[PDB]
Amino acid sequence: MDLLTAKTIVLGCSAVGAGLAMIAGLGPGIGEGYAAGKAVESVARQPEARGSIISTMILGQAVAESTGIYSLVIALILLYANPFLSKLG
Amino acid sequence: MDLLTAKTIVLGCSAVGAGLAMIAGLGPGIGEGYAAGKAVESVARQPEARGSIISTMILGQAVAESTGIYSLVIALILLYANPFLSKLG
Amino acid sequence: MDLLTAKTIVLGCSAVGAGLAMIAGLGPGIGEGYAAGKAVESVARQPEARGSIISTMILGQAVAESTGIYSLVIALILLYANPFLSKLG
Amino acid sequence: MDLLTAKTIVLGCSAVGAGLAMIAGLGPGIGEGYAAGKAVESVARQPEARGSIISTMILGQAVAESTGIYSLVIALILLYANPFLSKLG
Amino acid sequence: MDLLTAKTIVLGCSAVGAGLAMIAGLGPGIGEGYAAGKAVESVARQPEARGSIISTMILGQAVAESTGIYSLVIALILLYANPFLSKLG
Amino acid sequence: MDLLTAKTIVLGCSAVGAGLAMIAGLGPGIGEGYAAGKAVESVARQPEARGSIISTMILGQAVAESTGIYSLVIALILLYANPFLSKLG
Amino acid sequence: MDLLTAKTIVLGCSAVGAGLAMIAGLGPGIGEGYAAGKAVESVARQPEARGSIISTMILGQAVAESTGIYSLVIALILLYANPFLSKLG
Amino acid sequence: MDLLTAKTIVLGCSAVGAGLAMIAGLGPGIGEGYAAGKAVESVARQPEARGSIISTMILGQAVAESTGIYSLVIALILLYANPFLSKLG
Amino acid sequence: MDLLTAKTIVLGCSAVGAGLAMIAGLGPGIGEGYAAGKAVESVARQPEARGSIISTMILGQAVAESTGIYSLVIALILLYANPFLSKLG
Amino acid sequence: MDLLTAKTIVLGCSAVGAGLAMIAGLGPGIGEGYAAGKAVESVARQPEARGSIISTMILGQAVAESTGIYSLVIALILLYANPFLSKLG
Amino acid sequence: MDLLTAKTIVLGCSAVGAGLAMIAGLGPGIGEGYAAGKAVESVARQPEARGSIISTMILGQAVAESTGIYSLVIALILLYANPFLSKLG
Ligand SMILES: CCCCCCCCCCO[C@@H]1O[C@H](CO)[C@@H](O[C@H]2O[C@H](CO)[C@@H](O)[C@H](O)[C@H]2O)[C@@H](O)[C@H]1O
Ligand SMILES: CCCCCCCCCCO[C@@H]1O[C@H](CO)[C@@H](O[C@H]2O[C@H](CO)[C@@H](O)[C@H](O)[C@H]2O)[C@H](O)[C@H]1O
Ligand SMILES: CCCCCCCCCCO[C@@H]1O[C@H](CO)[C@@H](O[C@H]2O[C@H](CO)[C@@H](O)[C@H](O)[C@H]2O)[C@H](O)[C@H]1O
Ligand SMILES: CCCCCCCCCCO[C@@H]1O[C@H](CO)[C@@H](O[C@H]2O[C@H](CO)[C@@H](O)[C@H](O)[C@H]2O)[C@H](O)[C@H]1O
Ligand SMILES: CCCCCCCCCCO[C@@H]1O[C@H](CO)[C@@H](O[C@H]2O[C@H](CO)[C@@H](O)[C@H](O)[C@H]2O)[C@H](O)[C@H]1O
Ligand SMILES: CCCCCCCCCCO[C@@H]1O[C@H](CO)[C@@H](O[C@H]2O[C@H](CO)[C@@H](O)[C@H](O)[C@H]2O)[C@H](O)[C@H]1O
Ligand SMILES: CCCCCCCCCCO[C@@H]1O[C@H](CO)[C@@H](O[C@H]2O[C@H](CO)[C@@H](O)[C@H](O)[C@H]2O)[C@H](O)[C@H]1O
Ligand SMILES: CCCCCCCCCCO[C@@H]1O[C@H](CO)[C@@H](O[C@H]2O[C@H](CO)[C@@H](O)[C@H](O)[C@H]2O)[C@H](O)[C@H]1O
Ligand SMILES: CCCCCCCCCCO[C@@H]1O[C@H](CO)[C@@H](O[C@H]2O[C@H](CO)[C@@H](O)[C@H](O)[C@H]2O)[C@H](O)[C@H]1O
Ligand SMILES: CCCCCCCCCCO[C@@H]1O[C@H](CO)[C@@H](O[C@H]2O[C@H](CO)[C@@H](O)[C@H](O)[C@H]2O)[C@H](O)[C@H]1O
Ligand SMILES: CCCCCCCCCCO[C@@H]1O[C@H](CO)[C@@H](O[C@H]2O[C@H](CO)[C@@H](O)[C@H](O)[C@H]2O)[C@H](O)[C@H]1O
Ligand SMILES: CCCCCCCCCCO[C@@H]1O[C@H](CO)[C@@H](O[C@H]2O[C@H](CO)[C@@H](O)[C@H](O)[C@H]2O)[C@H](O)[C@H]1O
Ligand code: NA
Ligand code: NA
Ligand code: NA
Ligand code: NA
Ligand code: NA
Ligand code: NA
Ligand code: NA
Ligand code: NA
Ligand code: NA
Ligand code: NA
Ligand code: NA
């Protein structure tokens, strides 16, 4: 096996691996969508409390967002800063 | 391995990886759909407050949209600005 | 490898990638169905607000449709404007 | 590679991608079923508004169906108007 | 590659695509079951409105069934009216 | 490729295709479960209407069952009346 | 190829297919679990009607169990009454 | 093909098939957890009806466990009472 | 085929099969989490009955845990007490 | 087959198998999230009961976590104490 | 097999396995989002309790986050501190 073959296989697997990691993004999309609906209902029933409600929404959603970011970071690593390449040469 | 074989395998894996990443889009669809439903419900109870209600809906949905955008970017990178090619030669 | 073999595998992987991307469309189907169901319910309780109900539904459903559109775009690119072909040689 | 081998792989992959795409159909199935159930409970509680309830059900369901149509079209294309065949010769 | 090999591979990928397509059938199973649940509950509360209740259920369920039917059509095509064969010559 | 190799591959893919299709059975499993629960609650609340409730449960569950049967038929066809065999021999 | 090879591949694919088919069992597990929860709640609110409530629960679960059985029959066929073997040698 | 090769492939496939079957166990876990939750809620409100609330819970959970057992049996057969080795020779 | 190759393939397949089986663990995670949720609001509303509430939760969750254990067992067997090795070959 | 080839393949399958096992962690995330939401709702209603609410939350969440831990243990075993290598040499 | 091929195939499998592990992150995303929605709703209805409402959310979400963190750790190990390399040469 030459070096070109080594990179080809590893980067190819890296591409598939990156795609698989990104699937996790469906979760925050669902969970934050729920926090959004609750906010819509809450500002409707109690308009004078709007600012407090939005802050609580953004705070809650930001936390729910993290595992989305984890997947993104993993993907970007496999794409732009692949740790495997240095192990071949 | 010749270069043409190397690129073929990598770009092919990139196509599959891109499709997998896009699956995440199901999440925001569900989540934002929920936010839509609550707006519908809230507008019926308080038709005069519509403006503030959709305003809150859009803000929430926008945040719920992000992980969909992350996947789209990753896919578009793999298709149009593939980072693996330069590593192959 | 010759050119015909290159395109063949890249296009083949592109077809699968397109199919995978379109799976995301299940999301909006669920989410918008939820908005639809809330519209039905709302029209039944406040029938006088039917016009405001329907227009809120459409708008919210339009927003939740977006990631379904993203996937469709990715799939059509892969099928009709494949950006891998011109990278092979 | 000869034309037949090139056609074989491209069409074989096209068959899998089309099947993958059709998986999206479960979404509208769930979402529309929800709208249907809300319609049932509503014409019972409010039999005076049956016309506008069923009218609202159909419209909301139709919008919810669109991504199912998207995937069906992609499948139909891969099946009957395959765009990869022309890239082969 | 000879014609028998061509047909073998293409048909094999078709059997798999068909199975994948049929997966979508889980959606309508969930949605229509929900519509049935509301119908059961509605018949109990308004025993005399059973006619309109059930009629509403069937109509809504029929709509929800459609994408399960699309998948069944795609599968039957791949099995009994395969469009790929006439391309191999 | 000889006849035996052809039949082996296409039948092998057919077994996998049948199993994939059978995955759709989870849907009616869930949906009909929901209708069952609503029946348990409703019969306990409205004993005078038991027969009308159970009858409503069965009809609704039967409609929900349909896509499960579709899958079962496709699986049965692939297993006992395989339509690919006459295209290979 | 020889007989042993033909049978090996087919029986091998049949193992995976049987496994895939069994995945559908998750549905009835969810659906019936839901019916059980409703039974519990009904019994709590009306302890004297425990026998009647249970009876309704078992009936509704029997119906929900059906597609799990379908998947089980398909898997048992592939393992014990494999219809592909007579198609080979 | 020699006998060892035949045994290796089928058992290899059998191992994968067994794991796929076990995936189904997730359903019963969800459904029974729901029943468990209803028991917890019911025991608190009607503590006089405990035991009767518990026994109903166990019964319902027992029923919901069935498809999980089916998958266990299939997995146990593939691992210990493999019905394919008998066909190899 | 030699015995080292035979064991390599069978164990490799066994590793994947163990991973697949463990996926089932998500179900009990969802179900028991629900039971925990009901327990929390019950002890809030009915502080005196805390002993009975925690007791029902543990029992109910124990039941829901079983299929998770079934999968853990299958996995452990595949890893430490592999029943395939002694049939090679 | 040489030893290095044997180890390569079995470890390669172990990496994939471990990744599959970790997928189960999505369950506890959903489940424990639900428990957390019930705690929030409960602390809002009985702010003074916060301490006992947290205790119950932590308990049930701990139970719900178990199958996540199982999956993790299975993965760490495959990575750090692989039970297959000894069978190969 | 030489060292380069061994490293290559293992790292390649490690990338995929890393991606599979990251899928679990969707769970916490859903779960934490749910807790977020409850906070949004609670904070509105009970302004005097915002402090304990928010703190309870953060705590519960943190517990819900753990299995995502586990998957992240596994992925980071496979990418940056690969345990299989040490066993090849
Ligand atoms: C998930 C989707 C996966 C899709 C995978 C598609 C894989 C396509 C592989 C192509 O590799 C070629 O197919 C050729 C044609 O049938 C072979 O003979 C071709 O190559 C030969 C040398 O190996 C000689 O005939 C000449 O070089 C050339 O004809 C060639 O097998 C092998 O190189
Ligand atoms: C999840 C995604 C998984 C993706 C897996 C993709 C696997 C792609 C395999 C491509 O096959 C390789 O092609 C090289 C180029 O043809 C061969 O080396 C060549 O140069 C080598 C070094 O000289 C020579 O030995 C020969 O030409 C041949 O062996 C090499 O052996 C062969 O394996
Ligand atoms: C943080 C986000 C940053 C986004 C940055 C986007 C930058 C895009 C630069 C162009 O991207 C790719 O670079 C490859 C490498 O230059 C090009 O392949 C070209 O060069 C390769 C060799 O380097 C060859 O193998 C290819 O065949 C040849 O097309 C490829 O076409 C091009 O799309
Ligand atoms: C999920 C996505 C999966 C994507 C998988 C893609 C797999 C690609 C496998 C390619 O296999 C190699 O293809 C080369 C052709 O591309 C062959 O070259 C040969 O035939 C070539 C021409 O086709 C000739 O140039 C020579 O024989 C040598 O160069 C080589 O033997 C063959 O092993
Ligand atoms: C969605 C799933 C799609 C799956 C598509 C699968 C397509 C498979 C195409 C196989 O094509 C054949 O592959 C052989 C290899 O298998 C080639 O010969 C090659 O086999 C070797 C490949 O290097 C040569 O070196 C040897 O001489 C030769 O017999 C042969 O020419 C080629 O036509
Ligand atoms: C989910 C989808 C799964 C799809 C699986 C598809 C599997 C395809 C397997 C490989 O096909 C090989 O194809 C060669 C193609 O050429 C044949 O070649 C043979 O007949 C060839 C000519 O057709 C001859 O050159 C020789 O027998 C050898 O080269 C023969 O079938 C076999 O070696
Ligand atoms: C979910 C999808 C699962 C897909 C599984 C696909 C499995 C494909 C197995 C292919 O098996 C090979 O086929 C070749 C076909 O050619 C055989 O060639 C032999 O018999 C051939 C003719 O059929 C002869 O030419 C020679 O023995 C050699 O060329 C060879 O023995 C056989 O092992
Ligand atoms: C769901 C999983 C399904 C898995 C199915 C796996 C099927 C494997 C069939 C293997 O049959 C063997 O295949 C070899 C090739 O791999 C043949 O190689 C032998 O023949 C070859 C092809 O002609 C070349 O290696 C040289 O010619 C010769 O080694 C060999 O005779 C043939 O018996
Ligand atoms: C999810 C399922 C995964 C399945 C993975 C495993 C698939 C099958 C792998 C290969 O098994 C092959 O069987 C051939 C026989 O059919 C062997 O032939 C050899 O021994 C043969 C005779 O037994 C000889 O002819 C030669 O060594 C060559 O032809 C060959 O070495 C061996 O590798
Ligand atoms: C999740 C499923 C993963 C499945 C992974 C399967 C990986 C491939 C397994 C089979 O590999 C073959 O084994 C043969 C031995 O059985 C080797 O024989 C060789 O050494 C043999 C004798 O030991 C010789 O006869 C020849 O080199 C050829 O016949 C052959 O080269 C090698 O390719
Ligand atoms: C869950 C993911 C699991 C991924 C598992 C990936 C396993 C990859 C195994 C690759 O094994 C190699 O395959 C070569 C063939 O492609 C063999 O070539 C040999 O036998 C070949 C024919 O089978 C011969 O041509 C020569 O011995 C050489 O070319 C070689 O020995 C064998 O080590
Ligand atoms: C998701 C997981 C995906 C895993 C994909 C793994 C793909 C592995 C392809 C391996 O191809 C084999 O090993 C070497 C690659 O170059 C080549 O043999 C050659 O190279 C070896 C490594 O240098 C030597 O040991 C052999 O002697 C020599 O014939 C062999 O022909 C080639 O088929
Ligand atoms: Na998070
Ligand atoms: Na987001
Ligand atoms: Na959107
Ligand atoms: Na739509
Ligand atoms: Na429809
Ligand atoms: Na139906
Ligand atoms: Na049924
Ligand atoms: Na059952
Ligand atoms: Na259980
Ligand atoms: Na647990
Ligand atoms: Na946790």
Side-chain angles (χ1 to χ4, degrees), chain K residues 24-51:
Chain K
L26 68 87
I30 297 173
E32 284 158 43
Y34 175 78
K38 292 319 220 166
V40 169
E41 187 179 2
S42 295
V43 127
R45 292 176 171 179
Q46 270 80 29
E48 264 192 274
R50 165 191 264 269

mmCIF file of all heavy atoms in Angstrom, chain K residues 24-51:
data_model
loop_
_atom_site.group_PDB
_atom_site.id
_atom_site.type_symbol
_atom_site.label_atom_id
_atom_site.label_comp_id
_atom_site.label_asym_id
_atom_site.label_seq_id
_atom_site.Cartn_x
_atom_site.Cartn_y
_atom_site.Cartn_z
ATOM 1 N N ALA K 24 -25.800 9.727 19.176
ATOM 2 C CA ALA K 24 -26.475 9.728 20.475
ATOM 3 C C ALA K 24 -26.771 11.132 21.001
ATOM 4 O O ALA K 24 -27.646 11.316 21.843
ATOM 5 C CB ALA K 24 -25.661 8.942 21.498
ATOM 6 N N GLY K 25 -26.032 12.118 20.505
ATOM 7 C CA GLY K 25 -26.182 13.494 20.942
ATOM 8 C C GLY K 25 -27.549 14.095 20.671
ATOM 9 O O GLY K 25 -27.915 15.111 21.257
ATOM 10 N N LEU K 26 -28.313 13.469 19.778
ATOM 11 C CA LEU K 26 -29.656 13.949 19.457
ATOM 12 C C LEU K 26 -30.579 13.817 20.668
ATOM 13 O O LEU K 26 -31.492 14.616 20.864
ATOM 14 C CB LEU K 26 -30.236 13.221 18.231
ATOM 15 C CG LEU K 26 -30.611 11.736 18.288
ATOM 16 C CD1 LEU K 26 -32.034 11.531 18.800
ATOM 17 C CD2 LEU K 26 -30.432 11.096 16.918
ATOM 18 N N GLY K 27 -30.325 12.795 21.477
ATOM 19 C CA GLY K 27 -31.095 12.537 22.680
ATOM 20 C C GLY K 27 -31.154 13.700 23.656
ATOM 21 O O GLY K 27 -32.239 14.222 23.933
ATOM 22 N N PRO K 28 -29.987 14.112 24.191
ATOM 23 C CA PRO K 28 -29.917 15.276 25.083
ATOM 24 C C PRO K 28 -30.495 16.533 24.449
ATOM 25 O O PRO K 28 -31.113 17.331 25.141
ATOM 26 C CB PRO K 28 -28.411 15.444 25.313
ATOM 27 C CG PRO K 28 -27.854 14.069 25.171
ATOM 28 C CD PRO K 28 -28.687 13.425 24.086
ATOM 29 N N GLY K 29 -30.286 16.698 23.146
ATOM 30 C CA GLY K 29 -30.830 17.832 22.420
ATOM 31 C C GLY K 29 -32.338 17.907 22.561
ATOM 32 O O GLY K 29 -32.909 18.967 22.812
ATOM 33 N N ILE K 30 -32.983 16.755 22.413
ATOM 34 C CA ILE K 30 -34.426 16.650 22.593
ATOM 35 C C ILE K 30 -34.808 16.836 24.057
ATOM 36 O O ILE K 30 -35.672 17.643 24.393
ATOM 37 C CB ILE K 30 -34.955 15.282 22.110
ATOM 38 C CG1 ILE K 30 -34.722 15.115 20.609
ATOM 39 C CG2 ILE K 30 -36.435 15.130 22.445
ATOM 40 C CD1 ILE K 30 -35.053 13.730 20.090
ATOM 41 N N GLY K 31 -34.137 16.086 24.924
ATOM 42 C CA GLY K 31 -34.422 16.091 26.347
ATOM 43 C C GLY K 31 -34.212 17.428 27.033
ATOM 44 O O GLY K 31 -35.054 17.876 27.806
ATOM 45 N N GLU K 32 -33.084 18.070 26.749
ATOM 46 C CA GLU K 32 -32.782 19.370 27.348
ATOM 47 C C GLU K 32 -33.702 20.463 26.822
ATOM 48 O O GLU K 32 -34.039 21.403 27.538
ATOM 49 C CB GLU K 32 -31.309 19.745 27.141
ATOM 50 C CG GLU K 32 -30.365 18.990 28.053
ATOM 51 C CD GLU K 32 -28.949 18.941 27.534
ATOM 52 O OE1 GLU K 32 -28.460 19.977 27.045
ATOM 53 O OE2 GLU K 32 -28.338 17.855 27.610
ATOM 54 N N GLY K 33 -34.108 20.327 25.566
ATOM 55 C CA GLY K 33 -35.047 21.254 24.966
ATOM 56 C C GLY K 33 -36.389 21.182 25.662
ATOM 57 O O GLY K 33 -37.066 22.189 25.862
ATOM 58 N N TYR K 34 -36.775 19.972 26.047
ATOM 59 C CA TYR K 34 -38.031 19.773 26.758
ATOM 60 C C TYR K 34 -38.018 20.478 28.112
ATOM 61 O O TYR K 34 -38.971 21.169 28.478
ATOM 62 C CB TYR K 34 -38.326 18.283 26.956
ATOM 63 C CG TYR K 34 -39.567 18.048 27.786
ATOM 64 C CD1 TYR K 34 -40.832 18.193 27.229
ATOM 65 C CD2 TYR K 34 -39.476 17.699 29.130
ATOM 66 C CE1 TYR K 34 -41.974 17.992 27.983
ATOM 67 C CE2 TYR K 34 -40.610 17.495 29.894
ATOM 68 C CZ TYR K 34 -41.858 17.643 29.314
ATOM 69 O OH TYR K 34 -42.991 17.439 30.070
ATOM 70 N N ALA K 35 -36.931 20.289 28.851
ATOM 71 C CA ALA K 35 -36.752 20.960 30.134
ATOM 72 C C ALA K 35 -36.739 22.469 29.940
ATOM 73 O O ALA K 35 -37.208 23.220 30.790
ATOM 74 C CB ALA K 35 -35.466 20.497 30.810
ATOM 75 N N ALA K 36 -36.192 22.904 28.808
ATOM 76 C CA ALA K 36 -36.140 24.320 28.470
ATOM 77 C C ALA K 36 -37.540 24.896 28.299
ATOM 78 O O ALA K 36 -37.822 26.009 28.732
ATOM 79 C CB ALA K 36 -35.311 24.539 27.206
ATOM 80 N N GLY K 37 -38.416 24.123 27.662
ATOM 81 C CA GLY K 37 -39.785 24.541 27.429
ATOM 82 C C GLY K 37 -40.571 24.678 28.718
ATOM 83 O O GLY K 37 -41.379 25.591 28.880
ATOM 84 N N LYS K 38 -40.322 23.761 29.648
ATOM 85 C CA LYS K 38 -40.984 23.787 30.948
ATOM 86 C C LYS K 38 -40.558 25.003 31.761
ATOM 87 O O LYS K 38 -41.352 25.580 32.505
ATOM 88 C CB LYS K 38 -40.715 22.496 31.727
ATOM 89 C CG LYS K 38 -41.373 21.275 31.119
ATOM 90 C CD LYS K 38 -42.778 21.611 30.650
ATOM 91 C CE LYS K 38 -43.760 20.497 30.937
ATOM 92 N NZ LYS K 38 -45.162 20.966 30.776
ATOM 93 N N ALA K 39 -39.296 25.390 31.607
ATOM 94 C CA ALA K 39 -38.764 26.559 32.298
ATOM 95 C C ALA K 39 -39.411 27.833 31.781
ATOM 96 O O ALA K 39 -39.821 28.694 32.555
ATOM 97 C CB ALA K 39 -37.250 26.627 32.145
ATOM 98 N N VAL K 40 -39.491 27.936 30.459
ATOM 99 C CA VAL K 40 -40.127 29.066 29.792
ATOM 100 C C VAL K 40 -41.559 29.258 30.283
ATOM 101 O O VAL K 40 -42.008 30.377 30.527
ATOM 102 C CB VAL K 40 -40.134 28.867 28.260
ATOM 103 C CG1 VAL K 40 -41.022 29.900 27.591
ATOM 104 C CG2 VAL K 40 -38.720 28.922 27.709
ATOM 105 N N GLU K 41 -42.264 28.144 30.442
ATOM 106 C CA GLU K 41 -43.654 28.162 30.876
ATOM 107 C C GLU K 41 -43.777 28.498 32.360
ATOM 108 O O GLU K 41 -44.647 29.267 32.768
ATOM 109 C CB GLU K 41 -44.305 26.807 30.583
ATOM 110 C CG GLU K 41 -45.799 26.759 30.838
ATOM 111 C CD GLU K 41 -46.395 25.407 30.514
ATOM 112 O OE1 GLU K 41 -45.628 24.501 30.129
ATOM 113 O OE2 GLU K 41 -47.627 25.248 30.643
ATOM 114 N N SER K 42 -42.892 27.914 33.162
ATOM 115 C CA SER K 42 -42.902 28.117 34.608
ATOM 116 C C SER K 42 -42.534 29.544 34.999
ATOM 117 O O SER K 42 -43.208 30.169 35.818
ATOM 118 C CB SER K 42 -41.948 27.133 35.291
ATOM 119 O OG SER K 42 -42.386 25.799 35.132
ATOM 120 N N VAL K 43 -41.457 30.049 34.406
ATOM 121 C CA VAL K 43 -40.944 31.382 34.712
ATOM 122 C C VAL K 43 -41.999 32.471 34.496
ATOM 123 O O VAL K 43 -42.026 33.483 35.200
ATOM 124 C CB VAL K 43 -39.642 31.684 33.915
ATOM 125 C CG1 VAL K 43 -39.745 33.000 33.136
ATOM 126 C CG2 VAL K 43 -38.436 31.683 34.846
ATOM 127 N N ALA K 44 -42.882 32.241 33.530
ATOM 128 C CA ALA K 44 -43.964 33.173 33.247
ATOM 129 C C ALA K 44 -45.026 33.134 34.347
ATOM 130 O O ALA K 44 -45.383 34.162 34.921
ATOM 131 C CB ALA K 44 -44.586 32.863 31.885
ATOM 132 N N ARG K 45 -45.520 31.935 34.635
ATOM 133 C CA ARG K 45 -46.588 31.746 35.614
ATOM 134 C C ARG K 45 -46.154 32.045 37.048
ATOM 135 O O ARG K 45 -46.957 32.489 37.867
ATOM 136 C CB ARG K 45 -47.139 30.322 35.539
ATOM 137 C CG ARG K 45 -47.902 30.002 34.273
ATOM 138 C CD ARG K 45 -48.310 28.544 34.268
ATOM 139 N NE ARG K 45 -49.227 28.217 33.183
ATOM 140 C CZ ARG K 45 -49.712 26.999 32.965
ATOM 141 N NH1 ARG K 45 -49.366 25.997 33.757
ATOM 142 N NH2 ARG K 45 -50.544 26.786 31.956
ATOM 143 N N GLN K 46 -44.885 31.789 37.350
ATOM 144 C CA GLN K 46 -44.368 31.996 38.700
ATOM 145 C C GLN K 46 -43.124 32.880 38.742
ATOM 146 O O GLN K 46 -42.019 32.381 38.956
ATOM 147 C CB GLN K 46 -44.081 30.654 39.383
ATOM 148 C CG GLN K 46 -45.256 30.088 40.168
ATOM 149 C CD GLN K 46 -46.280 29.382 39.295
ATOM 150 O OE1 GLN K 46 -45.948 28.834 38.246
ATOM 151 N NE2 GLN K 46 -47.535 29.395 39.730
ATOM 152 N N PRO K 47 -43.307 34.201 38.548
ATOM 153 C CA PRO K 47 -42.199 35.166 38.529
ATOM 154 C C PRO K 47 -41.379 35.191 39.818
ATOM 155 O O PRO K 47 -40.179 35.457 39.769
ATOM 156 C CB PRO K 47 -42.911 36.509 38.330
ATOM 157 C CG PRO K 47 -44.189 36.161 37.629
ATOM 158 C CD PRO K 47 -44.598 34.848 38.241
ATOM 159 N N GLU K 48 -42.018 34.923 40.953
ATOM 160 C CA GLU K 48 -41.325 34.927 42.242
ATOM 161 C C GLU K 48 -40.330 33.777 42.387
ATOM 162 O O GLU K 48 -39.571 33.727 43.351
ATOM 163 C CB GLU K 48 -42.323 34.874 43.403
ATOM 164 C CG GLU K 48 -42.684 36.225 43.998
ATOM 165 C CD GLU K 48 -43.424 36.098 45.315
ATOM 166 O OE1 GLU K 48 -44.663 35.951 45.287
ATOM 167 O OE2 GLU K 48 -42.766 36.141 46.376
ATOM 168 N N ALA K 49 -40.331 32.856 41.429
ATOM 169 C CA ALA K 49 -39.561 31.622 41.565
ATOM 170 C C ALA K 49 -38.485 31.431 40.496
ATOM 171 O O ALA K 49 -37.866 30.371 40.427
ATOM 172 C CB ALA K 49 -40.503 30.419 41.585
ATOM 173 N N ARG K 50 -38.271 32.457 39.675
ATOM 174 C CA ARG K 50 -37.328 32.400 38.552
ATOM 175 C C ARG K 50 -35.968 31.784 38.896
ATOM 176 O O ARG K 50 -35.450 30.947 38.157
ATOM 177 C CB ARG K 50 -37.123 33.795 37.949
ATOM 178 C CG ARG K 50 -35.910 33.898 37.039
ATOM 179 C CD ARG K 50 -35.602 35.344 36.688
ATOM 180 N NE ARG K 50 -36.175 35.737 35.406
ATOM 181 C CZ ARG K 50 -35.540 35.632 34.241
ATOM 182 N NH1 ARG K 50 -34.310 35.145 34.199
ATOM 183 N NH2 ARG K 50 -36.135 36.014 33.122
ATOM 184 N N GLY K 51 -35.405 32.201 40.024
ATOM 185 C CA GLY K 51 -34.102 31.730 40.463
ATOM 186 C C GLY K 51 -34.004 30.221 40.590
ATOM 187 O O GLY K 51 -33.115 29.593 40.017
#
